[PDB]
Amino acid sequence: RIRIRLKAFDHRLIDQATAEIVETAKRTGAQVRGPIPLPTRKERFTVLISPHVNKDARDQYEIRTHLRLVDIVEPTEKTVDALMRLDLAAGVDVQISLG
Amino acid sequence: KSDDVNGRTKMYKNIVDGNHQMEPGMPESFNVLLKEIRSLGINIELED
Amino acid sequence: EFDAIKIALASPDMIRSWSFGEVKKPETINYRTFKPERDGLFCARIFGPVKDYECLCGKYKRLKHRGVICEKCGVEVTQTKVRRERMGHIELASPTAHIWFLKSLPSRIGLLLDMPLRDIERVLYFESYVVIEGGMTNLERQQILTEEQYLDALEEFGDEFDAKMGAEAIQALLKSMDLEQECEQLREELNETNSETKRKKLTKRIKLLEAFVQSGNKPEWMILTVLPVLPPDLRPLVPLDGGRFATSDLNDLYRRVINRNNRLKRLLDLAAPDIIVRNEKRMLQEA
Amino acid sequence: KKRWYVVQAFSGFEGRVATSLREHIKLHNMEDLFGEVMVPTEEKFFPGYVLVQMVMNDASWHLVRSVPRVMGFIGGTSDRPAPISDKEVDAIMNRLQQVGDKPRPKTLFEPGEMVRVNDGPFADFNGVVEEVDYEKSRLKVSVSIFGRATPVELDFSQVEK
DNA sequence: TCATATTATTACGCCAGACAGGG
DNA sequence: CCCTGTCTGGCGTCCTCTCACCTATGA
Ligand SMILES: [Zn+2]
């Protein structure tokens, strides 16, 4: 089975990507597993915002890396190859893995 | 009447339409002669 | 539409221009199903698709893209009679002189290289050696050599010395045969002699020497290097009433030439001794 | 001193020609006139020529040509046929009948950048693998996908060197 | 089933055409 | 060197009809 790991910072974008991937899968092949949402990584950062000194002065940023696990149960000849053509939205790292 | 295949299909259409006319063409067995002589080391052609 | 029919010799460039693909494997067909062989005598890419406007294996089952050739099929996409006009070529490993120009009575290569038919066949069937521009030794150009004549010469003239055999040697002789030069010589020889027999023997040799210069026929086109194969449609493989294929005789001939040529390429590619290969090239010559 | 010679057999019956040749030697007991006999036969190069350590008497020549399924020697002439070299047959000796073919242990998974994936979605496909996760049994073969060079976690058994 | 590759009979009748032999 | 037996190749009627018979091998 083809496991697909979508990773992105924007959630909407990721969602869009996932849908597209599903569409790509579903026309060619059959029995797409589904878009399973894994836990989001909220990598936080604190920094001092003064140039020199004021320690209680701080900004707390974060990067929300979202995960989408799409799986394809039956890899046909038409389906797997299709991925190459269908171009998705930018800033979405995909990670397909057969078996 | 014998050999040329496009010639005889043109002939059959022309006979069932009343025309009575032949488009001659070439015997296909002469092309077979060209392929059998040409399949040796001999280079037979058709000039002009 | 067209005037006169012109006949001439077939150059290896001319035979490669006729062709549409090298016929390698001798395997005719599958014989247990219906499909042919990829890529054997009855190929797909070299010639054409059995079915009209169809990839025999699987793509294009309508009338839109006539021509596409996928990697899964290695097939052209045209008419059912397209294979009847298309011909293949067999890359003969070892050079083989034509039998029509070696045994026509009089032989074309017999009265051109000033050598007796008997001696021409000896060297041609790997039974005699022939010298070719030896050098500073005591030997002629047309004069042949035997095993004993070569062995002694081998230990004698080990340096500048050339003495090959077979069609290869013959080809060289023909290739290195200044036609024009011979004309004057022959013409001068005919005007400087009174011998009746010689006169007729010289006028028949100079007639075929000046006629070759008048046309675009080369002396090295006598030996077959790029053997041409007749179209499958013209060597048809139909089964009779039953379950077996009544095969033509030309398929036996082409399949043997290709079997022997594959054997000769494999023996030449294994870096084996230089003599081994005389029987192999002789069997290819006879094939 | 025994020098080498080349024998031509019916190609395909070469091991049986070699066995019959050894047996004709031990029948007509010219044991001092034959050293060895190289006749390979794979499930095969050279599958058509038999190398014989020999000397040249006309009796031993008639012996080798009276061995069945043997055409004759290959040389300059048929009166005094030709020896070649010891190195020529030397190569054959090494792989005369040594355990060869149908055996690919650790020499059938070479990473480099030449492999084909078949035990998965990549139907009849190949790609270049830059990095590899042997420890966790993973491969980063970058198969030409989506108009680029995106890698895909494949299985060692799933791919083929 | 899928590659492997060629040997133990003679008994036509001219008629040209090329070839080694010899006065 | 000009006759000469001797050997080798190359011909041998068109049209039609009926029937039967078709490579061995093999770990
Ligand atoms: Zn196709």
XYZ file of C-alpha atoms (C1' of nucleotides) and ligand atoms in Angstrom:
646
model
C 0.000 0.000 0.000
C 1.154 3.594 -0.766
C 1.343 5.706 2.405
C 1.497 9.451 1.697
C 2.726 11.934 4.302
C 1.723 15.531 3.541
C 3.521 18.158 5.654
C 2.960 21.927 5.592
C 2.828 25.090 7.711
C -0.464 26.440 6.311
C -3.350 24.125 7.226
C -5.759 25.240 4.501
C -3.088 24.691 1.857
C -2.377 21.223 3.231
C -6.080 20.388 3.143
C -6.292 21.554 -0.462
C -3.293 19.406 -1.370
C -4.807 16.362 0.316
C -8.082 16.712 -1.568
C -6.203 17.038 -4.852
C -4.186 13.914 -4.094
C -7.379 12.012 -3.272
C -8.913 13.132 -6.561
C -5.816 11.996 -8.437
C -5.977 8.612 -6.727
C -9.708 7.996 -7.031
C -10.219 8.466 -10.801
C -7.386 6.108 -11.811
C -7.389 3.500 -9.013
C -9.944 2.314 -6.462
C -10.368 2.178 -2.666
C -8.373 5.200 -1.517
C -7.829 4.697 2.220
C -8.525 8.290 3.353
C -7.080 11.621 4.575
C -6.145 10.841 8.200
C -5.011 13.853 10.276
C -1.996 13.098 12.500
C -0.899 15.359 15.391
C 0.337 18.870 14.548
C 3.832 19.892 15.657
C 3.681 23.250 17.480
C 7.409 24.078 17.632
C 7.532 27.140 19.932
C 10.288 29.759 20.376
C 10.822 32.487 22.973
C 13.135 35.447 22.254
C 14.173 38.664 23.969
C 12.783 41.555 21.933
C 15.016 44.311 23.294
C 18.307 45.011 21.426
C 20.137 45.264 24.734
C 18.450 44.647 28.028
C 14.944 43.886 29.214
C 14.475 40.205 30.001
C 10.773 40.133 30.847
C 10.246 41.730 27.390
C 9.594 38.738 25.129
C 7.921 37.458 21.973
C 6.782 33.840 21.792
C 6.530 32.545 18.228
C 5.622 29.113 16.882
C 5.572 27.096 13.663
C 2.557 24.771 13.315
C 3.664 21.861 11.109
C 0.504 19.951 10.094
C 0.506 16.273 9.078
C -1.863 14.511 6.683
C -1.630 10.753 6.237
C -3.218 9.644 2.955
C -3.003 5.938 2.103
C -3.690 4.092 -1.190
C -4.556 0.401 -0.745
C -4.394 -0.859 -4.375
C -1.494 0.502 -6.480
C -2.516 -0.011 -10.136
C -0.354 0.774 -13.190
C -2.290 3.988 -14.053
C -2.567 5.407 -10.524
C 0.954 5.471 -9.101
C 2.420 6.958 -12.266
C -0.311 9.722 -12.344
C 1.270 11.513 -9.275
C 4.045 12.991 -11.551
C 1.514 15.115 -13.592
C -1.054 16.435 -10.987
C 0.844 19.503 -9.515
C -0.340 20.609 -5.972
C -0.057 23.979 -4.074
C 3.479 25.235 -3.106
C 4.938 24.912 0.455
C 3.591 21.366 0.943
C 6.247 18.673 1.407
C 4.649 15.306 0.319
C 6.260 11.895 1.172
C 4.867 8.821 -0.746
C 6.086 5.346 0.465
C 4.960 2.003 -1.204
C 4.955 -0.776 1.463
C -8.878 -7.909 -63.510
C -5.986 -9.785 -61.939
C -3.458 -8.079 -59.733
C -3.757 -4.387 -58.844
C -5.848 -4.154 -55.693
C -6.649 -0.423 -55.742
C -7.209 -0.759 -59.482
C -9.763 -3.502 -59.029
C -11.666 -1.759 -56.237
C -11.854 1.356 -58.446
C -13.007 -0.991 -61.211
C -15.756 -2.546 -59.103
C -17.115 0.856 -58.056
C -16.948 2.018 -61.683
C -18.789 -1.053 -62.963
C -21.621 -0.822 -60.430
C -21.982 2.871 -61.261
C -22.086 2.390 -65.049
C -18.788 4.278 -65.682
C -16.813 1.572 -67.637
C -13.239 2.894 -67.130
C -10.037 1.566 -65.588
C -7.443 3.307 -63.462
C -4.398 1.190 -64.341
C -1.713 1.359 -61.672
C 0.952 -1.325 -61.276
C 0.784 -5.107 -60.781
C 1.547 -5.921 -57.160
C 3.391 -9.070 -58.226
C 5.885 -6.857 -60.035
C 6.552 -5.251 -56.661
C 7.070 -8.791 -55.395
C 9.640 -9.241 -58.183
C 11.335 -6.034 -57.030
C 11.463 -7.291 -53.454
C 12.863 -10.684 -54.450
C 15.552 -9.225 -56.716
C 16.226 -6.482 -54.180
C 16.591 -9.038 -51.356
C 19.763 -10.231 -53.095
C 22.742 -7.943 -53.422
C 21.073 -6.448 -56.507
C 19.730 -2.866 -56.509
C 16.778 -2.706 -58.890
C 14.851 0.578 -58.966
C 12.387 2.596 -61.042
C 13.991 5.665 -62.616
C 12.623 9.187 -63.229
C 4.684 7.726 -64.779
C 8.142 6.211 -65.245
C 10.595 5.404 -68.043
C 13.348 2.725 -67.967
C 14.146 0.249 -65.179
C 17.708 0.564 -63.886
C 19.600 -2.349 -62.350
C 22.906 -1.994 -60.511
C 24.808 -3.339 -57.530
C 23.672 -2.766 -53.959
C 26.034 -0.798 -51.772
C 25.925 -1.394 -48.001
C 24.719 2.197 -47.638
C 22.014 1.402 -50.184
C 20.994 -1.726 -48.269
C 20.874 0.231 -45.028
C 18.719 2.783 -46.827
C 16.262 0.097 -47.953
C 16.027 -1.258 -44.450
C 13.828 -0.461 -41.478
C 15.593 -2.402 -38.725
C 18.283 -5.000 -38.118
C 16.915 -8.527 -37.908
C 18.844 -10.060 -35.008
C 17.212 -13.127 -33.442
C 16.337 -16.121 -35.680
C 13.316 -16.960 -33.522
C 10.405 -16.930 -35.967
C 7.279 -16.867 -33.810
C 6.029 -17.849 -30.354
C 4.235 -20.870 -31.886
C 2.190 -21.718 -28.733
C -0.037 -18.599 -29.022
C -0.269 -16.241 -31.994
C 2.255 -13.486 -31.302
C 5.570 -13.210 -33.206
C 9.031 -12.496 -31.785
C 10.512 -9.266 -30.349
C 12.859 -8.854 -31.842
C 13.347 -11.801 -34.194
C 12.828 -12.466 -37.894
C 9.168 -11.463 -37.798
C 9.618 -8.360 -35.647
C 7.244 -5.447 -34.710
C 9.580 -2.262 -34.534
C 11.750 -3.297 -37.539
C 8.740 -3.872 -39.774
C 5.164 -3.074 -38.780
C 2.046 -4.069 -36.814
C 0.257 -7.239 -37.921
C -3.157 -5.650 -37.447
C -4.120 -2.513 -39.372
C -3.686 0.660 -37.312
C -3.206 -1.276 -34.067
C -0.450 -1.804 -31.695
C -0.323 -5.652 -31.768
C 0.365 -5.670 -27.965
C -1.988 -2.858 -26.690
C -2.726 0.949 -27.363
C -4.547 2.887 -30.296
C -7.804 1.030 -31.049
C -9.459 3.820 -33.046
C -8.317 6.342 -35.743
C -6.564 9.247 -34.086
C -2.852 8.774 -33.295
C -1.416 6.689 -36.141
C 2.327 6.455 -35.437
C 3.009 6.565 -31.682
C 5.395 3.823 -30.474
C 5.286 3.042 -26.732
C 8.093 1.199 -24.917
C 5.702 -1.647 -23.890
C 5.101 -2.495 -27.605
C 8.223 -1.544 -29.664
C 5.808 -1.527 -32.654
C 5.098 0.909 -35.718
C 1.373 1.920 -36.443
C 0.352 1.594 -40.184
C -1.634 -0.736 -42.902
C -1.633 -4.532 -43.180
C 0.212 -4.387 -46.502
C 2.952 -2.129 -45.140
C 5.065 -5.131 -44.136
C 5.050 -6.445 -47.715
C 7.123 -3.493 -48.930
C 9.374 -3.167 -45.859
C 12.560 -5.292 -45.786
C 15.095 -6.106 -43.076
C 18.877 -6.459 -43.126
C 21.155 -8.998 -41.439
C 24.498 -7.673 -40.214
C 26.692 -10.544 -41.395
C 29.517 -10.941 -38.877
C 31.931 -12.295 -41.484
C 32.025 -11.010 -45.092
C 30.536 -13.379 -47.682
C 31.018 -13.027 -51.438
C 27.958 -13.306 -53.677
C 27.405 -16.635 -55.435
C 25.965 -14.939 -58.526
C 29.220 -13.055 -59.107
C 31.472 -15.969 -58.164
C 29.789 -18.770 -60.112
C 27.954 -17.345 -63.129
C 30.119 -18.859 -65.901
C 32.027 -16.806 -66.468
C 32.332 -15.564 -62.886
C 32.241 -11.798 -62.389
C 35.080 -12.034 -59.868
C 36.888 -14.625 -61.981
C 37.734 -12.501 -65.014
C 38.114 -9.300 -62.988
C 40.827 -10.282 -60.509
C 42.651 -12.391 -63.107
C 42.331 -15.539 -60.994
C 41.062 -19.050 -61.850
C 37.709 -20.089 -60.366
C 39.268 -23.118 -58.661
C 41.742 -20.929 -56.764
C 39.036 -18.385 -55.939
C 36.873 -20.997 -54.204
C 39.794 -22.512 -52.306
C 40.539 -19.238 -50.527
C 36.821 -18.483 -50.200
C 36.185 -21.695 -48.276
C 38.987 -21.186 -45.885
C 41.280 -23.629 -47.687
C 43.859 -21.234 -49.139
C 45.504 -17.922 -48.272
C 45.834 -14.875 -50.533
C 48.472 -12.140 -50.493
C 47.554 -8.447 -50.465
C 50.291 -5.839 -50.948
C 52.952 -7.782 -49.049
C 55.815 -5.321 -49.407
C 59.522 -5.954 -49.943
C 59.186 -9.726 -50.328
C 59.425 -12.243 -53.171
C 55.708 -12.761 -53.782
C 53.067 -11.557 -56.249
C 49.695 -9.932 -55.550
C 47.443 -12.503 -57.225
C 49.580 -15.477 -56.203
C 47.966 -17.489 -53.409
C 49.504 -19.250 -50.415
C 48.977 -22.586 -48.677
C 49.469 -23.651 -45.060
C 53.064 -24.659 -45.780
C 53.618 -21.598 -47.976
C 52.320 -19.327 -45.218
C 54.017 -21.062 -42.283
C 57.449 -20.692 -43.867
C 56.637 -17.133 -44.939
C 55.378 -16.342 -41.438
C 58.778 -17.189 -39.959
C 60.495 -15.506 -42.911
C 58.600 -12.271 -43.560
C 57.328 -11.663 -40.029
C 57.278 -7.896 -40.504
C 55.687 -6.040 -43.422
C 53.572 -8.896 -44.790
C 49.859 -9.331 -45.496
C 48.243 -12.663 -46.376
C 44.552 -13.034 -45.526
C 41.867 -15.410 -46.808
C 38.140 -15.748 -47.463
C 35.835 -12.982 -48.663
C 37.671 -10.448 -46.492
C 40.882 -10.930 -48.462
C 38.956 -11.070 -51.735
C 37.118 -7.865 -50.849
C 40.409 -6.088 -50.188
C 41.779 -7.244 -53.546
C 38.717 -5.901 -55.343
C 38.671 -2.761 -53.197
C 42.334 -2.089 -53.960
C 42.010 -2.625 -57.715
C 42.586 0.560 -59.713
C 40.027 0.108 -62.489
C 41.269 2.971 -64.683
C 44.895 1.826 -64.390
C 43.970 -1.674 -65.597
C 42.114 -0.233 -68.612
C 45.183 1.390 -70.159
C 47.316 -1.641 -69.302
C 44.786 -4.043 -70.810
C 44.305 -1.744 -73.812
C 48.071 -1.491 -74.287
C 48.388 -5.244 -73.816
C 45.826 -5.838 -76.560
C 47.668 -3.524 -78.954
C 51.068 -5.047 -78.182
C 50.123 -8.674 -78.839
C 49.147 -10.875 -81.784
C 48.026 -13.999 -79.927
C 44.534 -14.848 -81.160
C 43.488 -16.640 -77.971
C 45.070 -13.932 -75.811
C 43.350 -11.207 -77.833
C 39.928 -12.708 -77.098
C 40.948 -13.359 -73.493
C 42.080 -9.745 -73.126
C 39.097 -8.181 -74.901
C 36.661 -10.002 -72.617
C 38.474 -8.794 -69.502
C 38.795 -5.168 -70.609
C 35.130 -5.091 -71.634
C 33.985 -5.823 -68.082
C 36.649 -3.498 -66.671
C 35.614 -0.387 -68.588
C 31.913 -1.139 -68.174
C 32.319 -1.026 -64.397
C 33.927 2.407 -64.668
C 31.122 3.675 -66.895
C 28.580 3.023 -64.142
C 28.512 3.663 -60.398
C 29.231 0.040 -59.504
C 32.092 -0.509 -57.065
C 34.406 -3.575 -56.965
C 33.795 -4.014 -53.228
C 30.036 -4.370 -53.718
C 30.464 -7.953 -54.909
C 30.989 -9.211 -51.371
C 27.870 -9.190 -49.202
C 28.335 -7.286 -45.939
C 24.783 -6.176 -45.166
C 22.616 -9.091 -46.309
C 19.031 -7.991 -47.082
C 15.978 -9.998 -46.003
C 12.777 -10.338 -48.021
C 9.536 -8.936 -46.521
C 7.593 -11.402 -44.321
C 4.431 -10.885 -46.384
C 6.447 -12.190 -49.322
C 7.637 -15.176 -47.243
C 4.251 -15.958 -45.732
C 3.747 -18.080 -42.649
C 0.243 -19.518 -42.915
C -1.013 -22.659 -41.151
C -2.791 -25.338 -43.129
C -5.965 -27.057 -41.891
C -4.898 -28.195 -38.446
C -2.773 -26.766 -35.658
C 0.702 -26.449 -37.147
C 2.366 -23.839 -39.359
C 3.509 -24.921 -42.808
C 6.630 -22.769 -42.942
C 8.300 -21.561 -46.113
C 11.800 -22.479 -47.205
C 13.173 -18.944 -47.045
C 12.411 -18.824 -43.337
C 14.656 -21.869 -42.914
C 17.390 -20.143 -44.921
C 17.197 -16.814 -43.064
C 16.894 -18.522 -39.694
C 20.049 -20.522 -40.355
C 22.008 -17.467 -41.495
C 20.955 -15.625 -38.351
C 21.743 -18.609 -36.069
C 25.219 -18.865 -37.573
C 25.806 -15.109 -37.468
C 24.902 -14.998 -33.782
C 27.310 -17.885 -33.153
C 30.067 -16.094 -35.029
C 29.559 -12.859 -33.095
C 29.725 -14.798 -29.837
C 32.930 -16.586 -30.866
C 34.472 -13.293 -31.968
C 33.428 -11.616 -28.699
C 35.009 -14.275 -26.461
C 38.621 -13.430 -27.438
C 39.294 -16.998 -28.572
C 42.186 -18.100 -30.852
C 42.345 -16.637 -34.407
C 41.858 -19.957 -36.263
C 38.763 -21.451 -34.324
C 36.399 -19.172 -36.351
C 37.515 -20.381 -39.772
C 34.932 -23.154 -39.627
C 32.410 -20.685 -38.243
C 32.931 -18.120 -41.000
C 33.000 -20.929 -43.566
C 29.648 -22.219 -42.348
C 28.323 -18.656 -42.566
C 29.681 -18.333 -46.114
C 28.004 -21.564 -47.147
C 24.795 -20.512 -45.365
C 56.499 -31.733 -23.282
C 52.775 -31.581 -24.045
C 51.375 -28.578 -25.894
C 47.788 -27.429 -26.194
C 45.356 -27.952 -29.052
C 41.787 -26.972 -29.924
C 39.110 -29.562 -30.759
C 35.708 -28.828 -32.286
C 32.703 -30.791 -31.044
C 29.000 -30.711 -31.787
C 28.116 -27.646 -29.739
C 25.883 -28.773 -26.880
C 27.310 -32.269 -26.368
C 30.602 -30.891 -25.105
C 30.741 -32.476 -21.654
C 29.865 -35.834 -23.177
C 32.646 -35.321 -25.747
C 35.080 -34.601 -22.892
C 34.007 -37.722 -20.983
C 34.210 -39.924 -24.096
C 37.647 -38.464 -24.832
C 38.977 -39.346 -21.363
C 37.486 -42.815 -21.777
C 39.073 -43.360 -25.209
C 42.407 -42.349 -23.668
C 42.008 -44.930 -20.912
C 40.868 -47.520 -23.485
C 43.687 -47.219 -26.010
C 46.111 -46.589 -23.060
C 48.183 -43.811 -24.600
C 48.210 -42.344 -21.106
C 51.621 -40.718 -21.623
C 50.249 -38.720 -24.590
C 47.434 -36.736 -22.924
C 47.540 -34.358 -19.984
C 44.139 -32.767 -19.368
C 40.787 -32.101 -21.032
C 38.773 -28.896 -20.641
C 35.144 -29.390 -21.683
C 32.744 -26.871 -20.098
C 28.954 -27.230 -20.006
C 26.754 -24.724 -18.178
C 23.147 -25.327 -17.138
C 29.153 -22.025 -20.836
C 31.906 -20.281 -22.817
C 33.355 -21.533 -24.871
C 30.401 -23.842 -25.538
C 31.828 -25.312 -28.717
C 35.553 -25.894 -28.370
C 37.413 -28.409 -26.219
C 40.966 -27.701 -25.089
C 43.313 -30.708 -25.000
C 46.815 -30.972 -23.576
C 48.427 -33.354 -26.023
C 51.395 -34.240 -28.189
C 51.269 -34.774 -31.931
C 51.626 -38.238 -33.335
C 49.371 -39.370 -36.152
C 48.142 -42.187 -33.898
C 46.946 -39.721 -31.252
C 45.468 -37.531 -33.987
C 43.431 -40.476 -35.296
C 42.497 -41.218 -31.678
C 41.030 -37.765 -31.057
C 39.215 -37.752 -34.384
C 37.888 -41.267 -33.722
C 36.325 -40.015 -30.482
C 32.616 -39.693 -31.393
C 30.885 -36.352 -32.013
C 34.188 -34.629 -32.820
C 34.611 -32.807 -36.113
C 38.348 -32.158 -36.110
C 41.159 -29.928 -35.030
C 41.287 -26.243 -35.920
C 44.606 -25.059 -37.247
C 46.542 -23.833 -40.221
C 46.373 -27.185 -42.021
C 45.050 -30.706 -41.516
C 48.432 -32.381 -41.976
C 50.123 -30.670 -39.008
C 47.398 -28.930 -36.976
C 48.259 -25.905 -34.914
C 48.914 -25.385 -31.205
C 47.917 -22.055 -29.687
C 48.827 -21.103 -26.119
C 48.521 -22.186 -22.489
C 47.034 -18.889 -21.324
C 44.194 -19.229 -23.837
C 42.904 -22.332 -22.059
C 44.060 -21.020 -18.670
C 41.076 -18.668 -18.409
C 38.639 -21.527 -19.046
C 40.286 -23.675 -16.369
C 39.265 -21.274 -13.599
C 35.579 -21.478 -14.538
C 35.561 -24.903 -16.203
C 32.831 -26.200 -13.893
C 33.252 -24.088 -10.758
C 30.127 -23.113 -8.804
C 28.863 -20.357 -11.102
C 25.453 -18.784 -11.947
C 22.070 -18.598 -10.170
C 23.653 -17.326 -6.945
C 23.480 -13.684 -5.869
C 24.095 -13.282 -2.096
C 25.343 -9.851 -1.004
C 26.319 -8.909 -4.556
C 22.701 -8.350 -5.595
C 21.798 -5.282 -3.538
C 24.543 -2.797 -4.533
C 23.071 0.708 -3.803
C 25.084 3.214 -5.922
C 22.285 4.712 -8.092
C 21.064 1.799 -10.304
C 17.973 -0.129 -9.023
C 14.391 -1.015 -10.149
C 11.231 -1.056 -7.933
C 8.568 -3.737 -8.671
C 7.212 -4.977 -5.315
C 5.033 -1.879 -5.020
C 3.197 0.909 -6.887
C 6.186 1.659 -9.127
C 5.146 -0.815 -11.827
C 8.218 -1.591 -13.956
C 10.100 1.464 -12.701
C 13.722 2.405 -11.872
C 15.395 5.379 -10.100
C 18.598 6.774 -8.478
C 18.980 6.225 -4.674
C 21.131 8.949 -2.994
C 20.897 8.087 0.756
C 19.668 4.740 2.233
C 18.354 3.604 5.675
C 19.754 0.008 5.794
C 19.539 0.050 9.647
C 15.773 0.629 9.431
C 15.586 -1.173 6.038
C 14.619 1.938 3.972
C 15.755 3.382 0.583
C 15.581 7.011 -0.713
C 15.450 6.058 -4.452
C 14.546 9.306 -6.315
C 12.262 8.028 -9.102
C 11.386 10.559 -11.807
C 8.008 11.705 -10.478
C 6.028 14.956 -10.755
C 8.495 16.432 -13.247
C 11.401 16.298 -10.800
C 13.442 13.877 -8.692
C 11.369 13.034 -5.617
C 12.559 10.050 -3.533
C 10.261 7.330 -2.096
C 10.825 5.074 0.978
C 11.058 1.622 -0.717
C 11.787 -1.870 0.753
C 15.088 -3.700 -0.020
C 13.101 -6.771 -1.233
C 10.577 -4.442 -2.989
C 13.431 -2.980 -5.143
C 15.905 -4.930 -7.369
C 19.634 -4.114 -7.906
C 8.818 -27.404 -23.544
C 12.305 -24.791 -25.924
C 16.372 -24.033 -28.077
C 20.182 -27.572 -31.223
C 21.372 -27.020 -36.178
C 22.512 -31.320 -40.818
C 24.141 -37.845 -43.019
C 24.183 -43.949 -45.291
C 22.937 -43.711 -54.359
C 23.675 -44.765 -59.578
C 19.670 -46.071 -64.945
C 18.793 -38.931 -70.220
C 20.364 -36.610 -74.536
C 22.070 -33.082 -76.794
C 24.648 -28.946 -76.925
C 27.363 -25.252 -76.030
C 31.406 -23.541 -73.229
C 35.518 -23.666 -70.774
C 40.020 -26.383 -69.643
C 44.455 -29.206 -69.341
C 47.148 -32.098 -72.749
C 50.203 -32.745 -76.553
C 52.800 -32.794 -81.780
C 51.243 -23.198 -79.715
C 46.529 -24.899 -82.386
C 43.417 -29.194 -82.215
C 41.347 -31.998 -78.678
C 38.904 -35.189 -75.347
C 36.757 -34.177 -71.303
C 34.019 -32.128 -67.884
C 30.410 -28.943 -66.285
C 26.076 -26.454 -66.815
C 21.708 -25.837 -68.936
C 17.616 -26.471 -71.583
C 13.726 -29.926 -72.392
C 4.492 -28.295 -73.745
C 0.638 -25.824 -72.530
C -4.444 -25.532 -69.841
C -7.382 -28.491 -66.298
C -9.292 -32.245 -62.543
C -9.177 -35.963 -58.466
C -6.780 -37.993 -54.150
C -3.190 -38.411 -49.922
C 0.892 -36.447 -46.896
C 3.624 -33.311 -44.277
C 11.345 -32.838 -38.260
C 13.210 -35.152 -34.150
C 14.959 -34.280 -29.994
C 13.621 -34.434 -24.130
C 15.858 -33.582 -19.268
Zn 1.275 0.677 -28.856
